[PDB]
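Loading example: each entry is read as six labelled lines plus one structure line.
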Amino acid sequence: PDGVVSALSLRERIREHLSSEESVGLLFSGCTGINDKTLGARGGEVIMVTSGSGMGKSTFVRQQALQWGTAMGKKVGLAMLEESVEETAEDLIGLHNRVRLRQSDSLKREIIENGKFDQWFDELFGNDTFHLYDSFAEAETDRLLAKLAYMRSGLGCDVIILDHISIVVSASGESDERKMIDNLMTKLKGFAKSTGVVLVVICHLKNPDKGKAHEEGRPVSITDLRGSGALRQLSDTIIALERNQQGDMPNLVLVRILKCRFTGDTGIAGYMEYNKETGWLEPSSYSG
Amino acid sequence: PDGVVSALSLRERIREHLSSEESVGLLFSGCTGINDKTLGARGGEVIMVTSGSGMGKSTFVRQQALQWGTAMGKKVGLAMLEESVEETAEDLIGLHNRVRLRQSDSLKREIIENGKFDQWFDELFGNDTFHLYDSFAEAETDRLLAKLAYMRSGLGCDVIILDHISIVVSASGESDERKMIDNLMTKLKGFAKSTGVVLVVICHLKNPDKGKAHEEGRPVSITDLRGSGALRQLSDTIIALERNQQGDMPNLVLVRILKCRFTGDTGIAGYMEYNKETGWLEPSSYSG
Amino acid sequence: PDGVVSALSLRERIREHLSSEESVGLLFSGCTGINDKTLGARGGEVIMVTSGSGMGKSTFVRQQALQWGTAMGKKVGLAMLEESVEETAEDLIGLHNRVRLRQSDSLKREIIENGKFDQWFDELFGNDTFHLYDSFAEAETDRLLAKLAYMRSGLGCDVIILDHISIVVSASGESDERKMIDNLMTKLKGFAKSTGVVLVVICHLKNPDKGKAHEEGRPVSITDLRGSGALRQLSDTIIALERNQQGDMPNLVLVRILKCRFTGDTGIAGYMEYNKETGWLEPSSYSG
Amino acid sequence: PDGVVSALSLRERIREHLSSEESVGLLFSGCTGINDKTLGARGGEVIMVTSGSGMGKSTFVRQQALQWGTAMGKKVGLAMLEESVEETAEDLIGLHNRVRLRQSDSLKREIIENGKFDQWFDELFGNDTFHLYDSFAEAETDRLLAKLAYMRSGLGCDVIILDHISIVVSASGESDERKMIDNLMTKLKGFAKSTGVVLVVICHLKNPDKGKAHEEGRPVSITDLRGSGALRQLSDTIIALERNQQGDMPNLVLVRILKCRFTGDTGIAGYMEYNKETGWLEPSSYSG
Amino acid sequence: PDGVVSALSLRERIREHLSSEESVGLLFSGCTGINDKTLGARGGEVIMVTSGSGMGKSTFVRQQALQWGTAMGKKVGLAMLEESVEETAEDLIGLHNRVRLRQSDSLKREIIENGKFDQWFDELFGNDTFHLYDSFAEAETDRLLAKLAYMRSGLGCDVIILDHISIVVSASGESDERKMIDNLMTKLKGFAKSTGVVLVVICHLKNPDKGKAHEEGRPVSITDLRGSGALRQLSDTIIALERNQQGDMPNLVLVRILKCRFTGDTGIAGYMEYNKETGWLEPSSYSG
Amino acid sequence: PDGVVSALSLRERIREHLSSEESVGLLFSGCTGINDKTLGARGGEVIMVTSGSGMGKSTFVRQQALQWGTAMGKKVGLAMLEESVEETAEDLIGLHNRVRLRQSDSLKREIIENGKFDQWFDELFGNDTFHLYDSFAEAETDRLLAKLAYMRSGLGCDVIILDHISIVVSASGESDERKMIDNLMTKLKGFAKSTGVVLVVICHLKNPDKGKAHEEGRPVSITDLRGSGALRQLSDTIIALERNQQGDMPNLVLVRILKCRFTGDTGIAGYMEYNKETGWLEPSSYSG
């Protein structure tokens, strides 16, 4: 069984690798420190965001989409296989206007009658920056990658967002979807690198059930990452959010970097606080 | 291959969304706050009510049925797998009339001979809203789902109450029922999401026997949930009731949103008090 | 598949229901309050009576049988596994005559010679209200359920007393008898509910060995129960006795209703005192 | 399956039982309280002594042999299947003369040369009171019972001692020796009752391995008794010794009565202290 | 059927006993007290030496071999299953000459060229007392016992040291080696008791991983013994060594007699200190 | 069955033994003291290097390889599973040239253009002392052992570095990978001992979540080790690094020898400091 290369014959591969192996562009918002320990995200790179169920993997990664295609005018590609394009649209809108438009059947009625809908809608999607995959009808790997690709080549996006990488739906009949996740992650790291598009992906965590878990504290280690850690490899960076919803500061969320190929600088990035009012992830002043 | 819609083309689809789109719905009775945190029970959502043995599950749940099928007139399907329809209806009658009919032989005799029974009966069951699965003789999964599907689709029920999801009774010959519970959920959640009905399901908790427990106070945690954390994912809201029956305030019960997908707002909703006289779980005013 | 009845069509079923649908039946003797938090012993239920070793379990249950079988004329079946029929009968006689018949040779000599025995015998067992299970030799589960089953349906006993539910003796070759204590329960509960007889079962306690315990006071909690809490669920009313034989009032025994399905009314029911003369547990007035 | 006797037809059996169902004779030494909670041991009765491995089941029961055949001049029958008649003889001798003749190769040499051996030997076994079974070559049940019987009928002993009731050695080929112990215990309770000989037996405890065990504290409950508790029935009394050899008072031993058919009075008898000097079990002044 | 001997007829057999009957024998080196509590190692007795990983077992044991085979001239059989005979003999040489030969490349070279090696060698191995099983290539139970039996019976060894009883290597195809360990003991203990040889066996401890552990201080308990408590019964003496390698006094080691059949005297024997220079475990003077 | 050699007949075997029987080999670089408590890395041994995530494990092991492979001219095999060959090679180069080659685009651009890369490359890998395992794609146990096996016997490496022993990827269908981490070890240990190569394996830590931990200081104990302590036994020297990146001296890392078969010398070996410029772990002087 040979695949044991010697370090001298690695010469031409180290040269290739050494030329354009990513400097600074696109820096996450909501908390500096993520930036201090990563320096934003690179094209060709694969950002991995994870956390317990219902903790803000979705809220954080959507904020970046927002900021990115607003303040720093970038073409964000959205692919939320678990929600209607109108729903994700909704979050972006309420989010943009610092409000929780879903949690308010009065505010929804409000803006539609009083006309602020058309107002907000244009002011936001006005620059034709945001674009989205559309379905809820189980998407296949190649199928998906194609459209994800169309968002990068056809529409010309800088950043693509794939929410939840477990929803596989491909060539069924081959045991333990532990490889699907693996295979998919490679195609994703492939396409990402060869097009140079910033690719942000969200994956979930296995359920420990061997101690007190995630929704109650417990940091997440590289191991706890769902999917036979093929993604802990192909992904260049890994953001993790932890918060004890049953505690005193359920809105207090710690950001932890589990990997940053680029700066190799890991650990705790800092803290954030959910604003039940704006729905935003504001930077906090904490330390335990 | 095209199906990648653009922000703008969505403006009208998103408008048609933001109205006649109900985010609130069927508010829980017993404590404002279960509402302030969860915005009521959405249709197509799975409500998970849990607690220690004999602590309130059954009663809290039953009270919700009584209000929804009365004051807010909705068809309520009841599948109380551990008691006869006459018993559950007995409680329902007692409950509606703010009296504990079961616990009183005198009151029973009474209302029977003074003709009042028939009154309370019409006055409640009159608008044909209450419907119940009947047997006690162990029900199977597809068998029950079949009947439940009937209520939802056949009778047009809006809410289906299924008390006790540990009573399985299905294809025996496959180790640990841990897979039965999980596959059941996946079917209920599925049933729920596709019919758009409101599904309130009760579950019990694994015996911690590693410290002081549930009927003695002691917060329930998402790990405490009997059934290998499948439901901890498939259900949308987890309502847990905690109380220390062996104390000064046995009837004081704490409400904890163990999870609420739709809002993400978890934590201590509030408190309620058991009224040994009416049998209702009235909202309280307390702080520990 | 219609077996889903609507409330209305149950009118008649519910009338025939509340009338002659006893919810107060067989009150306990020697301590009102047990009767207050439980409204007695309903047929079809499972009454659990536990305590530290040699602290009330036995006597209290033996007294209830004695009262129920006389003054109240019910038929009582005794399943005393750790003793012979003449052993338990000996106790009964003496117990009825407020005399420690066993701990005294002088008296056994007398009554037998002076003829008072035949008197006492006829006076206690005269009304054929007492029947027992006879053997002492390790009884198997199905082997048992069947005899108790006989007592009920064959002999017509309204009450059955199973002393010690740790003496399992069934299908050997299946790890941890923890399973045995659970399966047996499930068979008894079914037995009781279906047959409608009153089942008063005795079980012991887990030796905590983590604090000062049982023999020295210490309240018994539901967790403390032997056999992984299957019974904690299958039984409908758990009565627990506590006392400190190594304290000041070694005769003052506390009576705790650890659980009572029917009423939900839990907590300390009251107190009782041991009278070394009569061998009884006399009614007491106290508050610590 | 019938063996369900009625309490009226039990008349002639209760009469038999009531005549000579044992007052006071032979009271254990080393600690009063055992006596206060049992009143010595009766002829026909079966004393059961148990404790962890190496705690004094053997030292206690040998002290009684001593006292009994010395101060109260009774014919003690000894059957120590795990030690040479000369070894058990040794303990009795050193014991009698308040010394640990085994633990002293100097004291052994001493008395043999200086002539105190013949002295002690006569002064003790002088009254031809002690008698012993002889072998180490595995003894069968009937085989054993016969000799044990010969000690009661042939030699005319008041008290018989059978050390360690696990060493069965009988009709091999019948699964789980759980019955051997059971069967044997019956023959033993039989012969004991029908001859009227005091029978003291020593049995060991199962190994809990579910918490901190025996040699480190932990009282022994009736359950922990090795052998499918057939012996917790046939034996009339059950003495148990507990001591934490890894503690501060490894010589401090608590006596606990797990049963006393006669006085039914159980619990903690009191305490004792090993005298590393005399090897005796002296009464102590303690309370925890 | 007669075999019931009488006290008196025994006088001569008992005399012949009390002399040329050795109760002391082969005292442990390293701390008087292992002796004061156990009176040395009797022949036909099973010595159990245990401790945390790399804490001293091997060394304590090895030192016993060196003294017994030297100063008290006895034939010592060594079966060190985890090291070559040259290694064990290397230590033995180093040890005898109060130097750590292994840990010194200079000293090794030395004694080799200055001819001293040959001296130390004769001076030690000379009286042909040291014998060792040889291989490293996994030994089977009857295979090893066979060889061990050889040393005892063939070579006439008095003491057999068998290091590490977890290295089984026998009839594989029967779940959990827990039965291998137990059946091995039963064979060694048997081998021991019948040949009258002294058997010192080493075992390791189950990983507690439930608190602070063994190499950090933390008393070993009879439950901590790896191998389902078979050895906790079959061996006659259990010598355990405890030390906290991560402290101020890493080399201070505590001696605990976990059990000593022959005497019953258990507890803390004493302390010893590891001398990084001589490599010996010298007796200390300490008190915590 | 003779395979029992006598000490004497081993004279010659023991001479050829102590001579050219290295006990000091391959000392560690950058912190004398590791070398003091371990006398380096003997061939055939298994060196365990662990720590909190991102706290020294990687760098320290990467530095040892770098030194061993140059200044000392040994052959080193790298089995870095979480990185590509050009990735780890990139690190090495930069590491050798005390420059953060990865975290800096400007420099990769330079050296490649200014030709300094070819220089650096030849200077580091010139002597063909470096070889790697190539894949990234989940390697199976037997699949691996074989390649490492190749490096040793085929390529002649004196040292092999296996980064991350949690990336098992072997025979799936056997509960708890706890078994996997143990079996793999056993195969590596065997591999090492038999082949004679130096095996330096990296493994991570159990997240205590019971106190303040790893990322914040806290000493690592042996128990803290991932994979139920099979390694804690199979490995011959465990090196643990501790540090507080959320404290005062985030660069001061402590080096603890958790275990060292060979010498037994355990405890804190010393300290080191992280230099953000060089990316190295410089030798340090300290005492807290």
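The first helix of chain A runs from residue 11 to 18.
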